[PDB]
Structures are given as structure tokens and as C-alpha cells.
Write a protein that binds this DNA or RNA. Structure first.
Ligand SMILES: [Mg+2]
Ligand SMILES: [Mg+2]
Ligand SMILES: [Mg+2]
Ligand SMILES: [Mg+2]
Ligand SMILES: [Mg+2]
Ligand SMILES: [Mg+2]
Ligand SMILES: [Mg+2]
Ligand SMILES: [Mg+2]
Ligand SMILES: [Mg+2]
Ligand SMILES: [Mg+2]
Ligand SMILES: [Mg+2]
Ligand SMILES: [Mg+2]
Ligand SMILES: [Mg+2]
Ligand SMILES: [Mg+2]
Ligand SMILES: [Mg+2]
Ligand SMILES: [Mg+2]
Ligand SMILES: [Mg+2]
Ligand SMILES: [Mg+2]
Ligand SMILES: [Mg+2]
Ligand SMILES: [Mg+2]
Lengths: 97, 332, 123
RNA sequence: AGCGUACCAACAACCGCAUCAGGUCUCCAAGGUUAACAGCCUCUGGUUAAAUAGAAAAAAGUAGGUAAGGGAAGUCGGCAAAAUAGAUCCGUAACUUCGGGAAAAGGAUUGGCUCUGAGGACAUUAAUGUUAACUCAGAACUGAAACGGACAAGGGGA
RNA sequence: CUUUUUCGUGAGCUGAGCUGUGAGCUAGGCAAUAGUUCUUUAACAACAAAAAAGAGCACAAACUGUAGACGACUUUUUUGCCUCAGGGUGCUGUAAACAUGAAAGUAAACUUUUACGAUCUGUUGAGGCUUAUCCCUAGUGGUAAAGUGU
């Protein structure tokens, strides 16, 4: 059944091993995989503004942390939408339903 | 195995250049929680080698001893050791009488307690410990008094004793001849590359011999090393387990910030002079010498003057966390 | 196709790798050839459709015959060093399937006398 | 009057057996830094494609980078690599066909910021006004003593 | 096969003792035949169909990195683990913003007032970062699919 979640992901933990030309696509792939595994949905869609945010500093160094919102809809009966949340500080944020 | 540190000691060697001076030495720390004795096994001699008569178990065993018999305990009904411990004592005494009558070697089965360490594993380790001493009757009366108790480490070894160590070296995978065997590296002009052996053999034994070094797997080997000396046996009930008579700061053995890649040591432990094969967390087997040493080093007794407990992350500068706050004063 | 189970390669296995999923078949080498699986699935669907017409119950069908034959190959080229040209062939095949429905002294008077005497002697 | 006029011109339309990293003649030519149509970055116009993609990442290879103390002991042999490089101001031997050698060899300086001085034209009277354009000298402050900061760019001698 | 009788030997019977089992003692009555030999079908161990007496785990999956080319190996699956956060321990070297604070000097209104100014100082041992193979924490939110063999 439908549900909504707010989580933060730190990407430097996930892009630590790849080379310069692969740092941003690796982050994108990791975000998709994480969301799909946390929602039990094979169909995962990424909003274009989030993709724009991930690439804002070039291919070589994406941001170290990102806050996203995950919602599961009813449409392979279900699927997940992933959006971007703008924050000015990550200090206190834990994850919530 | 937990990690390493260094100490300060005064030398007592008449004739040496270091006869009356303070020196620094490296040491290794082994976490040594007590084991539990759970069974008995007896052997007799034959022309085909030693031979088992039978095995006798204690009346109750723990769940971390039973986990070692399963590839996946979380999905099982856990019926191991649930019928056999319910036998009358009469059968056990008849078996023990037979072992007293026909056997010549006794060994005791013991297991470790990984829940008292910071390890992720929950299965215990099982091993057999031979019991030397008097006659077989005395050996049997000795073992039975221990059949469901704890062995602390100071029941087995003594301070200033010499010990042997058995473990498995660190793994590295597939390595070349230059690293695996240490052969002379070949000139820069070589066409197909320079990290190899130039000649594999003469023409005519028309085969390669088994003494020629090749590429292959390096590390994760089994080793036995002699003559490692004991410097101190710590106790988990002791507040100043890393302080000396010359340094009365009240200290434990664990450095500021935890042993890197291991965790905090809060059981009793051993301090060994030197180094030991294996990674952090690697299980280390300890044994007495084949025959006792009587040399001057094995008999000399050691008095320590300083154990170091500064951080091994980065370049540590304080011995305790209170010094650090006292030095800087109030922060923002 | 989804790499949940494998196909053990027992005959044409020169250089094929080793895998974790082959232990199910008591073997060490396996692979996941998807194209072959799709081609076989089309034919099995045809077999089931032809069994629907002649009124057989599908739950009892057993594949009693599976035969694969190699057909005439197609032709292309590849180019090599020092001005040479070499073949670049293909390898097509045939397939056929059948499913089927499953459930679940001489008298010789002299010889007769010998037999009688033998049987008498053992009692 | 008659004949030609589409399209490619290599990036897959030409020659090389091919949709081959090769070969193949002319014209136009922006901004910044500079001696510079060099090197590096950019606007107009063009493109984001190459006989494949994903994951893992050890031996060994190929194209690169760094290395304490020593400094050719290596090798047939300093092969390969390293060191030097732009401008300005000083100083330059033997020998010589008197022209050279010569950038011989050697030495010092170089950023930023705030100032001072020197180089023209025009029109009313030695005075008065109106106006440029890039160069070259000197001084005080300033910084983890750095400044041809990337690019570009001689090793020398008997 | 009958008759007259003895001794050992044990099931039910407690070296009472019937009887089971073997070995004998008297006196008798009653068989064998396939036409001259063709291996004298004779042992040991199995199996099948009937009748009676007895009746669990491993692989896979998601984690782990003490392991690693791939296989293989070390681990966990609800006091565990993954995640993010707080705390510790370290690395770098004092953030952005304001200040009618400083600054070699400069020009422009009538002792001050306005303007420009490399750089410096105060708030500031500050700000950032720290496991992906660092340490601690019944802190937050999760912990999915039902497949294969025996
Ligand atoms: Mg060569
Ligand atoms: Mg260290
Ligand atoms: Mg503290
Ligand atoms: Mg070719
Ligand atoms: Mg050719
Ligand atoms: Mg006959
Ligand atoms: Mg035309
Ligand atoms: Mg035209
Ligand atoms: Mg031709
Ligand atoms: Mg071409
Ligand atoms: Mg091409
Ligand atoms: Mg390489
Ligand atoms: Mg360096
Ligand atoms: Mg060096
Ligand atoms: Mg030499
Ligand atoms: Mg030599
Ligand atoms: Mg050279
Ligand atoms: Mg000269
Ligand atoms: Mg500031
Ligand atoms: Mg982790």
C-alpha cells in the first residue's frame, strides 16, 4: 500500500572507488538502486530536477550528501517517485515516514 | 588479536652497551576471555597410530557451543545435543572406567566465548587441549572437577614464561615471482616485460622441475613460531591495568579511540614481546614449549616502567582524554 | 533469462566459467543464454496451443522428444593484416518437439524323468 | 545560337579488395593572455560519433607519476630519463682567414597595490585653455621568501 | 512306524519339575524298482510380490571482508544486522558576514566631513572533513521475496 518517506543519502561513501569520469553516473545509479531496494519496487522514476542537482558541479565531484523524498503509488501494480528536497543544513536530519 | 603498542623497560645485562639504560620495545595484545570445558576424550596406542575409545560430554552446554554445528541456525529447530545429555550417570562412569583402564592419552575439549568480544561472529571455536601430569587416574580426577566451569588464562600460564604461537598469516591473493620469491628484477630494455625469471631450466631434463619459482598465491599460510615472552597478564577486574610503579596514572590497556579495526578490550589479556602472524581479530593458539627453556632470557623477570596508551589514529599526543580537555581549556 | 537459475554446460564447455548456481546440477560450469531460451519458449507456446485444439489437458503433458539440428550457415567477411580476407560465418539450427499424455515348455520324456528324479533326490 | 549547371569532396560518396587511424590541389578567418595565424580557455557555425555494452578489479602488459641515503658503482656504450630555458641589467678566455668564436663561461632581478617623473597635437595670445596613445624609468607598503607561478621554453666545458 | 525304558539339556516352570531339545535301551513291521553313464540341478550372497509380528538438513537470497581473477573461503538474518544521526579519536589551519576598526598614499566640500585602497585585526584553535576495510550507542527508520535438492 502507498507510503511516503524522507531520507538522506551521503554519496562520498558510494563514489569513493570510481575514477573522475564515472563519479556522477555512479551516484545516479546508486540512488536508483537504493530507492528500489528500500521500497520493494522494480519501477523507479527519477525527477529531472534531482538529476539537475546531482550534476551541478560537473562530472568530477557531485555533492557529498542529498536529501530525497520517496513516495509509492498505485499505477507491476506499484512504482516509486523520487524527488529532491532543498535544505540549508544537514546537521540534525534523521529519516522519517 | 587486538593490536600493538610500546613499553619502556630497564635492561639488566652485565657486559652489554645497554647495561643500565631505559629502552623501548614493541608488544602485541591478545584478548583472553576464559573458556569453558565441555568434554573428555581418550586415546590408546596402536601400530596404526593413536586411536579413540570414546567421548563423554558434560550435562549442559551453551547455545554458542551448539551454533558451531549448523550452517544456518536462524532457520532451524535447534535439536542438536538435546537427547544425548539425558543419559544416566552410570553409563558415563562405566565409560570413564574403561578410559582409565585402556587409554594412555587424555585431552579436554574446550570452547571460546565470542559474545564477550566485539566480534560480529557468534559461533564459538572448539579445540582439544592435552593434559600432561601424573597417572591416568589423577588426570581423570583432575578433568572431571572442571567439566562445566571456566578456565581463566592465569590458570594455564605464568608471568615471564616463554610461549609458542600458532595462527594463519595475512592473505594477499595472486602475486608474481618478484614479490612471492624475491628474484632479481630484469633490465629496462627487455621486450615482453621485466618482472619474471629468465631461464626455466636447461635443455635436457626435458621437463620443468618443482624447485623453479613461478607465479601463484601468496599469504594465508599456517605457521608455528617459537619463543615469545610474556610481559604482563591483565585482569578485567583491575582499574589500573596499564599503570606501573613509576607511573601512577590510573589507566586501562585500550588506547584513546579504540584499537583501530578491532574495538575496545574489556576482558583480561596478554602482553607479548614482539609480533604475531595474522590480521586483527585473527584467532591465535598458544602452547607451552616442547621442553622447558633454561636459558638466561627465559628465566629473567621483567619490570615495566611505562605502557603507552596514546591514539594510534594519526599521531597521538596525550595519554588520556582528560589531559586533552585540560590542555585546551574551554572551547566554543 | 532472469539469472535466477543456470544451464549446465557439459559438452561444448571449452573455456566456460565456473559459477555458484551449477551445484544444483552437480556440476561446476554454467551460463545464462537468453536468446536460446526465447527461441525455445516460442516453440513451447506453439506446442501448447496445438494441444488446446485437440482436447488434451495441459497438466499431464510430458516432453518426450527434443531434437536440435544444425542448418546451412550464412556468409560474411572479415579483414586481416597484410591484405587478407577470411570467413565470418554464422550457425543457425532446427528444432522439433513432441509432448504426450501420461498417467500414474518342452516335454522331452527323458528330460521329464531327469527332473522328477532330481526333485525326488533333494527330499 | 550550341553545350555544362542536382549532390560528395572525404567526417562512411575519391584511390588503397571494405562504411580501412593512410594518401589527396586552392580561397575566407572573431575575443582574452602573448613577440606570435604558437600553446591554453571562450562567442558565431558544427557536434556529443566511432566493427559493442555492464560489473569486478589480483598476476602480467602498455602509456604515465613519485621515491629516504648514495650519485654511473649499471651497461659494449649515460641507451632512456633528469637538469637548463622568456625578458632586463652586468661580465665574457684560448684561438682566428680579423668577418668570428658568443646565448662562450658566469652573476643579479621579476607578483600585487598606492604614487612620482619623461616622451604629442590643436586654437586664442613669453600666458591662456581643449584634448589623446602606448611605452620606459624611480620610490613606499604588502605576503607561510613567493612571483617567465599553468602554458611555452638551449645543458655546459677540455 | 509302534513297544519297554535311561541320561544329559532349557524356553512357560521354582539343583519341585511337566514339556521343548539332543543321545540311547528292549521287542517287533514296513518301504526303495523309471530297462547301461552324459553336472550327482544339492553352496554362498541378493532381489520382488503378497501374509503376519514390530511407529530434519543443505543449497539458493539479502548482509559481511579476517577472503578474492572466477569458483572457493570467513560471517549475520530480530538483545542481531543495514542505515542515518549524536558522541570519540584524528587531518587541515582560523570560514561566510559585519566593524564611523587599522593601512604607504591619493582628491574634494567648507576641524571635521565625505570618497578609493594590496593587505592586517576582533567576534575565531574557527570552518570543513573523518569508513567506503576507524571506535561507542535496546538513539531514528527498516529487515524483502517462498524457489531447488534430499
Ligand atoms: Mg628491444
Ligand atoms: Mg596509525
Ligand atoms: Mg573528552
Ligand atoms: Mg581486421
Ligand atoms: Mg590493403
Ligand atoms: Mg534320458
Ligand atoms: Mg546551378
Ligand atoms: Mg550547386
Ligand atoms: Mg582496384
Ligand atoms: Mg577514411
Ligand atoms: Mg569508422
Ligand atoms: Mg598499469
Ligand atoms: Mg609528490
Ligand atoms: Mg632517490
Ligand atoms: Mg663502470
Ligand atoms: Mg660491471
Ligand atoms: Mg639521450
Ligand atoms: Mg668553444
Ligand atoms: Mg572573511
Ligand atoms: Mg559498515
Amino acid at each position: 500500500k502507498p507510503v511516503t518517506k524522507f531520507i538522506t543519502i551521503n554519496l562520498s561513501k558510494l563514489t569513493h572507488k570510481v575514477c573522475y569520469k564515472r563519479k556522477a553516473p555512479r551516484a545516479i545509479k546508486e540512488i536508483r538502486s537504493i530507492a528500489g531496494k528500500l521500497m520493494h519496487t522494480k519501477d523507479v522514476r527519477l525527477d529531472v530536477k534531482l538529476n539537475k542537482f546531482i550534476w551541478s558541479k560537473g562530472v568530477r565531484n557531485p555533492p557529498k550528501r542529498v536529501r530525497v523524498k520517496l513516495e509509492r503509488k498505485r499505477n507491476e501494480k506499484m512504482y516509486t517517485i523520487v524527488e529532491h528536497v532543498m535544505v540549508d543544513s544537514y546537521k540534525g536530519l534523521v529519516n522519517e515516514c | 588479536k587486538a593490536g600493538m603498542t610500546h613499553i619502556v623497560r630497564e635492561v639488566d645485562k652485565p657486559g652489554s652497551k645497554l647495561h643500565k639504560k631505559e629502552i623501548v620495545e614493541a608488544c602485541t595484545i591478545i584478548e583472553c576471555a576464559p573458556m569453558v570445558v565441555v568434554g573428555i576424550v581418550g586415546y590408546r596406542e596402536t601400530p596404526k597410530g593413536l586411536r579413540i575409545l570414546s567421548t563423554v560430554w558434560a550435562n549442559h552446554v551453551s547455545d554458542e557451543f551448539r551454533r558451531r554445528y549448523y550452517k544456518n541456525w536462524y532457520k532451524s529447530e535447534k535439536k542438536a545435543f538435546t537427547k544425548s545429555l539425558n543419559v544416566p550417570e552410570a553409563t558415563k562412569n562405566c565409560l570413564l572406567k574403561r578410559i582409565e583402564k585402556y587409554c594412555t592419552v587424555l585431552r579436554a575439549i574446550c570452547h571460546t566465548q565470542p559474545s564477550k568480544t566485539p566480534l560480529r561472529m557468534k559461533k564459538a571455536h572448539i579445540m582439544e587441549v592435552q593434559i600432561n601430569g601424573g597417572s591416568m587416574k589423577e588426570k581423570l580426577e583432575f578433568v572431571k572437577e572442571m567439566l562445566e566451569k571456566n578456565l581463566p588464562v592465569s590458570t594455564v600460564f605464568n608471568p615471564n614464561e616463554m610461549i609458542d604461537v600458532i595462527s594463519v598469516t595475512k592473505g594477499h591473493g595472486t602475486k608474481g615471482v618478484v614479490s612471492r620469491y624475491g628474484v632479481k628484477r630484469l633490465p629496462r630494455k627487455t621486450h615482453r616485460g621485466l618482472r619474471k625469471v629468465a631461464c626455466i631450466g636447461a635443455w635436457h631434463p626435458a621437463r620443468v622441475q618443482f624447485q623453479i619459482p613461478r607465479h601463484g598465491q601468496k599469504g594465508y599460510f599456517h605457521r608455528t613460531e617459537r619463543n615469545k615472552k610474556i610481559y604482563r597478564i591483565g585482569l578485567k577486574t583491575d582499574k589500573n591495568s596499564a599503570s606501573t610503579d613509576a607511573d601512577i596514572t590510573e589507566k586501562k590497556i585500550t588506547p584513546m579511540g579504540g584499537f583501530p579495526h578491532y574495538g575496545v578490550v574489556n576482558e583480561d589479556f596478554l602482553l607479548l614481546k614482539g609480533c604475531v602472524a595474522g590480521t586483527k581479530k585473527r584467532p591465535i593458539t598458544l602452547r607451552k614449549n616442547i621442553v622447558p627453556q633454561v636459558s638466561r632470557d627465559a628465566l629473567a623477570q621483567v619490570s615495566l616502567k611505562f605502557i603507552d596508551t596514546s591514539s594510534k589514529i594519526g599521531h597521538g599526543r596525550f595519554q588520556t582524554s582528560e589531559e586533552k580537555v585540560k590542555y585546551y581549556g574551554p572551547l566554543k | 533469462i532472469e539469472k535466477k537459475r543456470c544451464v549446465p554446460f557439459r559438452k561444448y564447455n571449452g573455456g566456460v566459467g565456473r559459477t555458484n548456481q551449477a551445484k544444483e546440477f552437480n556440476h561446476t560450469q554454467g551460463r545464462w543464454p537468453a536468446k536460446s531460451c526465447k527461441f525455445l519458449l516460442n516453440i513451447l507456446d506453439n506446442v501448447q496451443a496445438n494441444a488446446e485444439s485437440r482436447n488434451l489437458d495441459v497438466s499431464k503433458l510430458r516432453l518426450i522428444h527434443v531434437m536440435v539440428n544444425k542448418a546451412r550457415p550464412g556468409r560474411r567477411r572479415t579483414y586481416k593484416a597484410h591484405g587478407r580476407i577470411n570467413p565470418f560465418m554464422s550457425s543457425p539450427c532446427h528444432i522439433q518437439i513432441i509432448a504426450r499424455e501420461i498417467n500414474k515348455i518342452s516335454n522331452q520324456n527323458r528330460l521329464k524323468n531327469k527332473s522328477v528324479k532330481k526333485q525326488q533326490t533333494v527330499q
